[PDB]
Design a protein around this nucleic acid. Sequence first.
DNA 1: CTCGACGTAG
DNA 2: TACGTCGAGT
Lengths: 189, 189
Amino acid sequence: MLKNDDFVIAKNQLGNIVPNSVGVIRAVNGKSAMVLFIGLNELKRVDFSELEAIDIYRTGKGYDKKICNICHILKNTDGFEINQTDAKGRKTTRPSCRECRKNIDGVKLSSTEKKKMDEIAPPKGSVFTCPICEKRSIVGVTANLVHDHNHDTGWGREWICDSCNTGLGRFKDNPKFLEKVIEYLKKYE
Amino acid sequence: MLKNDDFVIAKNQLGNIVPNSVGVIRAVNGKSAMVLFIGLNELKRVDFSELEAIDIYRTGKGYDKKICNICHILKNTDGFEINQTDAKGRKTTRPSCRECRKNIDGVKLSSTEKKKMDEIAPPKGSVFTCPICEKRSIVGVTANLVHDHNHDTGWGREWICDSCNTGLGRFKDNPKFLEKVIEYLKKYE
DNA sequence: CTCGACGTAG
DNA sequence: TACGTCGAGT
Ligand code: NA
Ligand code: NA
Ligand code: NA
Ligand SMILES: [Zn+2]
Ligand SMILES: [Zn+2]
Ligand SMILES: [Zn+2]
Ligand SMILES: [Zn+2]
């Protein structure tokens, strides 16, 4: 019935694995499967009766439920925050569920740190040079600026362009991943 | 009358500065201004008769002309590539004009390098781990993947997630700016 | 709720 | 033409 490479959810609790955790079948033994539960990267032996096959292509945009890209638990659409709109007018939700976004968002910029950054804000319509990408721009006209902050401490960093800020987040604001980017680029340079 | 911090365009060719180049007024005397032309970062003394005031807030989205974020020349809207759609259904163009995009895009992935990459493409619906961000995903379900390539050589790099690929571009695929990101983050550790 | 920006997909 | 994704602004 189940085949290698098929996707399943846990029907019930399986040790550390909560219900609705998505796994992929990695081996089959009679009516038991070795399942890689993707969120925790845990390979477990599971009886077929404890698993429910799912169709990954009937999840996400256009469907009732969506698989989170961090925890890889199948959740209702409302477990994800609306974030954008496509050309066809449909709403797009973040790929990470509200629970996983708590850890990505971390500590908010404090009120005193915000006021402090606001007192040195580049004026709208001024000529700005971003301290990261070094691009010159006209504030609010040829680039939009943001209050960047450290989400471990809640304290301010600098005024930077939105492009750079949304780049930092792709790499988790973490020098570990930036160093990985450098060695990746250098490898093919 | 022209005031410091006002914006102007060059009416005519001014040495290295082409017409319609945007500049900011940095000093004024009775007949001329010191103008910083933003694209080339060139500060010149220009007679008032060779400058025209420009309302920077009547450029870009919703208007017939737009100021490029690299060259900072005022161009027709059609000099910029349509790239996205907002929630109100209006089209958004790239901030960089078609001419400036040539340098950003560089050399395309060659046919032969593309075929090499396609030979080792992760299957749709497989479990993938991005070599940069180290995030696990289900291909085409919880993350979309791309052919990354070096745009100086046209040679392939690796299959990576779209999030990482679009992060590389924010930092110009250039270790210089990635090292700047690292120093910036460490400063506010 | 909304946003622009990136290199991709096609 | 179009796409999702990021930390933001609103
Ligand atoms: Na930030
Ligand atoms: Na306006
Ligand atoms: Na790339
Ligand atoms: Zn989650
Ligand atoms: Zn920047
Ligand atoms: Zn340009
Ligand atoms: Zn990645």
